[PDB]
Ligand binder design. Structure first.
Ligand SMILES: Cc1cc(F)cc(S(N)(=O)=O)c1
Length: 435
């Protein structure tokens, strides 16, 4: 695996030991070969699990998720997928790693897609080796891969709303259930219904993941209600997955706005990762996977691949050269390399709108490309009437940095800034000049 110009896909089935058994072996071999190496974890949770699997090996943990004194003897760095892409975009020297290891390399967040593009381009150039670790590489068509123990697979109608009757099998269960829902708001309704029926429910989303995930270990629970983020190497001591088989798809309409389309079917890779949360213990057979719909290739036309192009267009590679998407996922977007490349000051603004502003890539790009500076929030208020953001069926209002109460009416509407209460709250603070 560790010869230059090689990109290896380690596609052992879920629970095969990629992270706990194979990764320490690769790290020892890289150290023996003097390979400057980066290990990319999808989440701070996985970063912490990796420290446990690697404990004692000289690894520099570039994450506050791990509390370790680094010796300065390390040639192996560990950071999150997003941190790698972030450091590439920022005016900061990222070492030219001889060996690039991405764990949970199926992650379809823009920063992970961008990281795979940059690394795969360095490998194609003959500059580096890479190992992508995932049971479900891009374009996988198998929703039912092998597991450590036999899984009971059942196609069943799964509730997406509160229910009074017709789903006795959901609550009649005495074990632990991980339940994949298409959105935070859909999970809130299911979580409330289950809590009302006497169930202990933990809710996971991207925004709450590190904090809430700890509850799965620190307290007894009956249900975890999670969005697609629990597809990225999150492990539970569970005996059942309920899978809606649905997700939201960010879609750019007419180059002008982003909507959250759906809910609609998950990819085969997503279905296999959801299912792959169970059947992981060879000493616990009888785990169940209940699925409520088919799969489809809903990554086609998905905004994340166009956002990944926006990020890669703004990462220095060599002179005017621009990293390509990793070949197997390079047709998911109609996009030309370099079309989103920004001039120096507009690019700094784009980075800051993402890093400090916490705006989605697409929205950060619209603001920066329009020549708006980071602290200029007039655009949050000067959009058309139909860009009005609604809060409980009434226009959302904020006090501007000027002390004026105004209707939140962004020049560019991205549904992700107001997809849930937490998102809208963060966007209100942004429109108000509070970060
Ligand atoms: C290249 C190299 C030299 C060395 F003396 C020690 C290491 S380490 N800290 O990875 O074991 C690596």
């Amino acid at each position: 695996m560790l010869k230059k110009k090689q990109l290896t896909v380690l596609d052992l089935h879920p629970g095969a030991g990629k992270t706990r058994r194979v990764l320490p072996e690769i790290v020892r071999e890289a150290i023996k070969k003097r390979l400057r190496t980066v290990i990319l974890a999808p989440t701070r949770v996985v970063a912490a699990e990796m420290e446990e699997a690697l404990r004692g090996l000289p690894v520099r943990y570039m994450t506050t998720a791990v509390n370790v004194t680094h010796s300065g003897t390390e040639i192996v760095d560990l950071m999150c997928h997003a941190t790698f892409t972030s450091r590439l975009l920022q005016p900061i020297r990222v070492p030219n790693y001889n060996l690039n290891i991405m764990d949970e390399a199926h992650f379809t967040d823009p920063s992970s897609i961008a990281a795979r593009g940059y690394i795969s381009t360095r490998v194609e150039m003959g500059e580096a080796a890479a190992i992508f670790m995932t049971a479900t590489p891009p374009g996988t068509r198998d929703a039912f891969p092998d597991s450590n123990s036999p899984i009971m697979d059942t196609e069943v109608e799964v509730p997406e709303r509160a229910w009074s009757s017709g789903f006795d099998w959901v609550t009649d269960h005495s074990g632990k259930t991980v339940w994949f829902v298409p959105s935070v708001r859909n999970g809130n309704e299911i979580a409330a219904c289950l809590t009302k029926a006497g169930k202990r429910v933990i809710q996971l989303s991207r925004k709450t993941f590190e904090t809430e995930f700890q509850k799965t270990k620190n307290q007894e629970w009956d249900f975890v209600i999670t969005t697609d983020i629990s597809e990225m190497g999150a492990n539970f001591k569970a005996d059942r997955v309920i899978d809606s088989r649905r997700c939201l798809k960010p879609v750019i309409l007419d180059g002008e706005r982003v909507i959250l389309a759906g809910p609609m079917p998950v990819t085969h890779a997503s279905a296999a990762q959801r299912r792959g949360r169970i059947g992981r213990n060879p000493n616990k057979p009888g785990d169940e996977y209940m699925y409520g719909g088919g799969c489809a290739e809903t990554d086609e036309g998905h905004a994340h691949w166009l956002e990944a192009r926006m990020l890669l267009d703004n990462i220095y590679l060599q002179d005017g050269l621009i990293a390509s998407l990793y070949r197997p996922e390079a047709d998911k977007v109609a996009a030309i390399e370099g079309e989103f490349k920004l001039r120096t000051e507009q690019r700094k603004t784009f980075v800051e709108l993402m890093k400090r502003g916490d705006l989605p890539v697409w929205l950060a790009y619209q603001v920066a490309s329009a020549g708006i500076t980071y602290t200029d929030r007039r655009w949050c208020f000067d959009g058309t009437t139909n860009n009005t953001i609604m809060e409980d069926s009434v226009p959302a209002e904020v006090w501007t940095k000027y002390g004026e109460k105004r209707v939140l009416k962004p020049r560019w509407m991205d549904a992700r800034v107001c997809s849930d209460h937490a998102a809208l709250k963060s966007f209100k603070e942004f429109a108000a000049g509070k970060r």
